[PDB]
Each structure stands twice: as C-alpha cells, then as structure tokens.
Amino acid sequence: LPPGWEKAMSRSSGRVYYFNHITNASQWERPSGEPARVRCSHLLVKHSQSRRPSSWRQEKITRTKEEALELINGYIQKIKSGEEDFESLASQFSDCSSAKARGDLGAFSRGQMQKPFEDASFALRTGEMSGPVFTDSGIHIILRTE
Numbered sequence: 001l002p003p004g005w006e007k008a009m010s011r012s013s014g015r016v017y018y019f020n021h022i023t024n025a026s027q028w029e030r031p032s033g034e035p036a037r038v039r040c041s042h043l044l045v046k047h048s049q050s051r052r053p054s055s056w057r058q059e060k061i062t063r064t065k066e067e068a069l070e071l072i073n074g075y076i077q078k079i080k081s082g083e084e085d086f087e088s089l090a091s092q093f094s095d096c097s098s099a100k101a102r103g104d105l106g107a108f109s110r111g112q113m114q115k116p117f118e119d120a121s122f123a124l125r126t127g128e129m130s131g132p133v134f135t136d137s138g139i140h141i142i143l144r145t146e
C-alpha cells in the first residue's frame with residue numbers, strides 16, 4: 001500500500017479499512033494509487049496551547065486542545081458527508097490568515113512547512129483530505145489540491 005498505509009479492522013463493523021499514520025486519513029476502500037512540489041489548502045483550529053493562541057477570529061484563543069480536536073472532527077464529518085465543503089468551512093472557521101483564500105496555501109517544496117504538516121501534505125494523493133494533523137500552530141485538516 002502507498003507511504004503510511006496500514007490495514008486495520010473496524011471497531012463497530014468488524015469490516016477491514018485502511019488508516020494512514022502520516023496523514024491520519026481513514027477510508028473503507030483499499031488505496032490503489034513523490035512529486036517535488038504539492039499544493040494544499042488547510043483549515044486550522046488553534047487552542048490555548050498553540051504557539052500563537054490568537055487569530056483573525058478571536059483575539060484570545062482559550063479552547064483546549066481536546067475541544068479543538070472535537071471541532072476538527074465535526075468539520076471532517078460535514079465535509080465527508082458533503083453537508084459542507086472544505087472551502088466553505090476553511091473560509092468561516094480556519095484560525096489561519098489563509099482562511100480569506102479558502103485556505104489555499106499555494107505550492108510548496110519539502111523543507112518549507114512544519115514537518116508534520118509537510119509530511120502529511122506529501123503523503124496525500126491529489127484531491128485527498130487528511131485527518132487531524134497536529135503541529136505547534138494547532139490542529140489542521142489538509143486538502144491536497146495539486
């Protein structure tokens with residue numbers, strides 16, 4: 001299976017699924033399908049322990065890391081169900097200044113982003129969205145777009 005993928009058994013179903021320990025993605029289908037540069041968007045939820053606990057949305061970020069993960073997990077659910085799209089939630093709720101660009105960060109090479117962010121970005125397939133990715137900025141959902 002490609003970089004980071006493992007087979008697991010589901011807790012509720014007993015059905016096989018696939019987990020990526022680099023992107024935190026999980027899916028039922030087996031993944032079937034490294035570039036010099038990728039383009040990604042993200043949605044960042046900061047918490048009280050973030051490096052800079054402040055954003056355009058809230059001068060003082062006070063939510064806990066656990067409450068930030070809860071928020072991230074709700075956004076992932078709405079995006080996977082198609083109830084909301086990624087761009088719309090990033091524009092409204094991302095604690096990054098890239099919110100005003102629907103979360104788009106542009107293209108980047110290895111060696112530019114925080115490591116856990118980079119590693120997740122380069123392990124995603126074009127079109128594919130990460131699970132929760134933790135960095136010192138806070139918690140991210142990453143969408144690889146190119």
Ligand SMILES: CN(CC(N)=O)C(=O)c1nc(-c2ccccc2)[nH]c1C(=O)O
Pocket residue numbers: 042044050051052054055095096097098105113114117135136137
């Ligand atoms: C850069 N930084 C402070 C830090 N020392 O991590 C942030 O917290 C931050 N980090 C990001 C970020 C993090 C990863 C990838 C792209 C952007 N955006 C912000 C922001 O405020 O707007």
